[PDB]
Amino acid sequence: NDTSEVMLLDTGWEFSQSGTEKWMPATVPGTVHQDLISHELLPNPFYGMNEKKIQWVENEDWEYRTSFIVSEEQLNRDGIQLIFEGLDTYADVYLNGSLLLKADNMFVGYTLPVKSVLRKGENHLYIYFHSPIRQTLPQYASNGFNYPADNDHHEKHLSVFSRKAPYSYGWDWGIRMVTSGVWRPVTLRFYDIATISDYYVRQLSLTDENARLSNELIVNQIVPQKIPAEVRVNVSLNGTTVTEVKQQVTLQPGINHITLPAEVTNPVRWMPNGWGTPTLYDFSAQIACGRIVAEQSHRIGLRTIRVVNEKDKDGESFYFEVNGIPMFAKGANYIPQDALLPNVTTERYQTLFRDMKEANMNMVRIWGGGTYENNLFYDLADENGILVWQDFMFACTPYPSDPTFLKRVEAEAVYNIRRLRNHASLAMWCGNNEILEALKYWGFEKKFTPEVYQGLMHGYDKLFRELLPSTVKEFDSDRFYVHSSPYLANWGRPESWGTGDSHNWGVWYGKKPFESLDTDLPRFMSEFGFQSFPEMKTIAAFAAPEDYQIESEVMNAHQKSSIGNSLIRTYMERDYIIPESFEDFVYVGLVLQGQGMRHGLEAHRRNRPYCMGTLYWQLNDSWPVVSWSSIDYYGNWKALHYQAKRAFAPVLINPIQQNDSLSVYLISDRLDTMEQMTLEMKVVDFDGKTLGKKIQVHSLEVPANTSKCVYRAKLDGWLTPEDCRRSFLKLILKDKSGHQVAESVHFFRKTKDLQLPPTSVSYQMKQTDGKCELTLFSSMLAKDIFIETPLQGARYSDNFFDLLPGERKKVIITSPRIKKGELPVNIKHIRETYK
Ligand SMILES: OC[C@@H]1[C@@H](O)[C@H](O)[C@H](O)c2nccn21
Numbered sequence: 001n002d003t004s005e006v007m008l009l010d011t012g013w014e015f016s017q018s019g020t021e022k023w024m025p026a027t028v029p030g031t032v033h034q035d036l037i038s039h040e041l042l043p044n045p046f047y048g049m050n051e052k053k054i055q056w057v058e059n060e061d062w063e064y065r066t067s068f069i070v071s072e073e074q075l076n077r078d079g080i081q082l083i084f085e086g087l088d089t090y091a092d093v094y095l096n097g098s099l100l101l102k103a104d105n106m107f108v109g110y111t112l113p114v115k116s117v118l119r120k121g122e123n124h125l126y127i128y129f130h131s132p133i134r135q136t137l138p139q140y141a142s143n144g145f146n147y148p149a150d151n152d153h154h155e156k157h158l159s160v161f162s163r164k165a166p167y168s169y170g171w172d173w174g175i176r177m178v179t180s181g182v183w184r185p186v187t188l189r190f191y192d193i194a195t196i197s198d199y200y201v202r203q204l205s206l207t208d209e210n211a212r213l214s215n216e217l218i219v220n221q222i223v224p225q226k227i228p229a230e231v232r233v234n235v236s237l238n239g240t241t242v243t244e245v246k247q248q249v250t251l252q253p254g255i256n257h258i259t260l261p262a263e264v265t266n267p268v269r270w271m272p273n274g275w276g277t278p279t280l281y282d283f284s285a286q287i288a289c290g291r292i293v294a295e296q297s298h299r300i301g302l303r304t305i306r307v308v309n310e311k312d313k314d315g316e317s318f319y320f321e322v323n324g325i326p327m328f329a330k331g332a333n334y335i336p337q338d339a340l341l342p343n344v345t346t347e348r349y350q351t352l353f354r355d356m357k358e359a360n361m362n363m364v365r366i367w368g369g370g371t372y373e374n375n376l377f378y379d380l381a382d383e384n385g386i387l388v389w390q391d392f393m394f395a396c397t398p399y400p401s402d403p404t405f406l407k408r409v410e411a412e413a414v415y416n417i418r419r420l421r422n423h424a425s426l427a428m429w430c431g432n433n434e435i436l437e438a439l440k441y442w443g444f445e446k447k448f449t450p451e452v453y454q455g456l457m458h459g460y461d462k463l464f465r466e467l468l469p470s471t472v473k474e475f476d477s478d479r480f481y482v483h484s485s486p487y488l489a490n491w492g493r494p495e496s497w498g499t500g501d502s503h504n505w506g507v508w509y510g511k512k513p514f515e516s517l518d519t520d521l522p523r524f525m526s527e528f529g530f531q532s533f534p535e536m537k538t539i540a541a542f543a544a545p546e547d548y549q550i551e552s553e554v555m556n557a558h559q560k561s562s563i564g565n566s567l568i569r570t571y572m573e574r575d576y577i578i579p580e581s582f583e584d585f586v587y588v589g590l591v592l593q594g595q596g597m598r599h600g601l602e603a604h605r606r607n608r609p610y611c612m613g614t615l616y617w618q619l620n621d622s623w624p625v626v627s628w629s630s631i632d633y634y635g636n637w638k639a640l641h642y643q644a645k646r647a648f649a650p651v652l653i654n655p656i657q658q659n660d661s662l663s664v665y666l667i668s669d670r671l672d673t674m675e676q677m678t679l680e681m682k683v684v685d686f687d688g689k690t691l692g693k694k695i696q697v698h699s700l701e702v703p704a705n706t707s708k709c710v711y712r713a714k715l716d717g718w719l720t721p722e723d724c725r726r727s728f729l730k731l732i733l734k735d736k737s738g739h740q741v742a743e744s745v746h747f748f749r750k751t752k753d754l755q756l757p758p759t760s761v762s763y764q765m766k767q768t769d770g771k772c773e774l775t776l777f778s779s780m781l782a783k784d785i786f787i788e789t790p791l792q793g794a795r796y797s798d799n800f801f802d803l804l805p806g807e808r809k810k811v812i813i814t815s816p817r818i819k820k821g822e823l824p825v826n827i828k829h830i831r832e833t834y835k
């Protein structure tokens with residue numbers, strides 16, 4: 001790209017527990033915990049009872065040192081900057097006897113001029129990480145109250161005083177690992193003349209005919225002379241130049257602001273997953289001085305995203321309009337992929353997005369108790385067509401709002417807004433998670449004096465209704481901001497449900513049946529969820545076999561909600577026979593979470609346009625644990641992920657049965673209307689025999705982006721109560737010429753009420769390496785089958801599906817670990833779980 005040289009400061013690091021004077025190799029980027037693990041100085045934090053055994057680390061200070069060589073020639077570059085992309089958290093950075101920086105914000109990158117401090121030959125970098133605990137003890141002691149951050153698993157809730165990942169202090173699905181270290185990359189850049197400080201591609205307008213852009217550059221010129229330069233912007237697509245623009249300047253010492261207009265005629269639009277291609281242009285900005293001294297590029301998607309949040313007859317709408325078209329949101333809430341962030345590899349990020357794209361998602365919420373994710377994450381969003389709802393990193397508690405804290409947050413907000421604002425995927429900012437809800441409804445007013453309660457309320461506005469929205473207005477002015485999710489709606493207050501987004505925790509915390517999701521509807525569901533134990537191979541990764549009960553102390557260990565086990569059983573008993581064995585119980589819990597949650601995903605799509613989106617809680621896990629996730633820590637899809645994929649299908653046949661009657665809806669998120677369609681249904685018993693005749697509804701239309709009822713029949717006089725216990729409804733949708741475009745299966749009774757016949761799923765297996773093709777067969781219905789393998793991270797073409805009486809079913813299992821010579825397979829189904 002340009003004449004600069006970058007040195008990656010990523011080898012030869014050592015670390016030491018302060019005071020010990022003992023030093024050992026470290027891996028950077030990394031964490032103090034991981035460095036210790038690598039030297040068997042801590043046990044596997046995720047195993048067994050090890051949480052309590054690793055806590056001591058957070059009471060210690062930790063130092064990091066590296067040496068590097070700089071040549072005479074490098075020292076004669078005009079400028080040299082040391083960039084820290086992340087320091088967790090209170091870090092005194094020393095280079096060659098100079099204190100360059102007192103870092104105090106995990107979420108901030110720092111760029112430091114170092115030429116004048118560097119020496120020819122060897123150079124010594126030394127970082128002192130103050131314990132974030134010991135650092136904030138005195139701050140907590142000055143405060144005279146304890147903030148109500150219940151997810152902070154310590155008597156003193158110190159999390160709130162630090163700009164550090166909230167979940168690192170513990171969460172209701174997470175381990176407490178209050179770590180430190182150089183958590184993103186360290187780079188030393190040697191350069192001439194200037195660097196591009198920021199390159200913002202600002203979209204001014206977009207029509208089918210023309211995209212107008214403003215290319216906004218901040219150049220930091222490091223020499224004392226005035227430098228004539230030419231600024232060049234090349235717009236390209238797939239390696240071919242689309243437009244090129246050019247601007248003569250004379251760069252002054254310090255910051256220069258340069259703006260160059262560019263246009264793209266007949267622009268190829270970036271579209272979300274399901275609606276077309278996630279087209280990305282390449283925008284390259286160069287500073288040319290006679291040599292290209294500086295260059296920076298962004299991949300740019302050309303699209304409009306408008307969040308429509310307006311008063312209406314139903315209350316206040318909350319929806320996303322994309323490229324002019326109201327887009328029903330289908331997705332999940334995302335949390336950190338690990339307790340130790342630098343352990344999340346490029347491959348792990350790629351697989352997560354594959355999992356989202358494959359489940360037909362078009363949106364993800366990066367929830368406020370994690371981090372502002374790394375550049376890769378948003379790059380993957382961009383190229384997978386997934387819209388991104390970005391919370392600022394505040395969750396579930398009120399926070400300080402003193403001048404100095406607000407200054408720190410302002411830096412963090414400016415840094416990440418500029419970092420993220422060029423991404424096609426970025427759709428909106430949200431000030432926090434559930435803080436206004438908490439302040440209003442979680443009983444804080446009986447916990448604090450009236451004066452401190454008032455200070456919390458005034459402090460709320462300072463941060464979330466003044467500082468954050470005004471910063472977004474300044475630096476990202478065409479992006480929506482909302483102060484909180486949920487902004488008004490509260491799950492115990494039906495009158496508030498028509499106003500904006502909902503976290504419906506009536507299911508789970510309120511003990512409400514899954515069927516309540518058909519009647520308790522939001523304008524937009526930004527959270528709802530249900531826990532499940534992960535499958536046995538994940539349990540085995542943290543527990544010995546003597547530990548495989550629900551309430552072993554092990555298992556308790558890996559259940560951070562406190563309530564969760566009894567809720568699971570309470571809900572399971574409503575719909576299923578509770579199995580006697582721990583492993584059968586784990587299996588039925590996976591089925592339960594998949595079935596109840598997908599009934600909600602279905603209600604929300606069915607009730608469009610009243611409801612315009614659904615993001616379940618939660619996509620993923622940070623470690624081996626019992627949680628609300630659809631994918632466990634090892635990347636195994638639970639039933640819920642397969643069920644999310646089905647419920648998010650572009651076209652879906654949705655049968656819904658209430659008050660002894662059946663409706664069938666056809667739901668489409670396609671951009672085109674389907675015409676001359678036939679819905680075909682037939683009642684089949686568990687032995688495979690059709691009851692009565694096929695039912696045909698011909699001449700159906702399925703308009704773009706609609707949910708519509710095409711069929712209703714009462715059960716009474718159609719099927720007897722015994723038929724209902726003994727048969728299912730198969731439903732297929734076909735075009736004019738009889739091509740199948742969709743299919744569903746419907747059961748008339750709760751699973752515990754079904755007269756399931758004893759049966760064996762037999763299978764044939766054809767195994768090559770990387771691969772296992774299974775052909776399954778059962779003469780009778782096998783209900784909710786789980787094809788279970790011991791192979792961590794094995795991917796399946798399908799799983800957690802009903803194998804229909806007599807119907808062959810092909811399933812492909814893939815894994816890099818499958819060898820050309822036989823994969824262990826155990827097939828479970830509902831009837832086996834009880835006598
Ligand atoms: O309890 C599970 C999850 C939390 O992990 C997370 O804070 C989320 O915002 C939420 N709201 C209600 C419950 N939940």
Ligand SMILES: [Br-]
Nearest residue numbers: 079080113115
């Ligand atoms: Br410099």
Ligand SMILES: [Br-]
Nearest residue numbers: 081111112113
């Ligand atoms: Br600099």
Ligand SMILES: [Br-]
Nearest residue numbers: 255256257258
């Ligand atoms: Br200027």
Ligand SMILES: [Br-]
Nearest residue numbers: 184185374375
């Ligand atoms: Br990174």
Ligand SMILES: [Br-]
Nearest residue numbers: 145448449452
């Ligand atoms: Br108080």
Ligand SMILES: [Br-]
Nearest residue numbers: 464465469483
């Ligand atoms: Br606001």
Ligand SMILES: [Br-]
Nearest residue numbers: 549550551552
């Ligand atoms: Br137990």
Ligand SMILES: [Br-]
Nearest residue numbers: 657658659660
């Ligand atoms: Br019913």
Ligand SMILES: [Br-]
Nearest residue numbers: 595745746747
């Ligand atoms: Br069902």
Ligand SMILES: [Cl-]
Nearest residue numbers: 043044047050
């Ligand atoms: Cl261990």
Ligand SMILES: [Cl-]
Nearest residue numbers: 109415418419
């Ligand atoms: Cl940046």
Ligand SMILES: [Cl-]
Nearest residue numbers: 655656657658
């Ligand atoms: Cl139903």
Ligand SMILES: [Cl-]
Nearest residue numbers: 758759831832
């Ligand atoms: Cl059986």
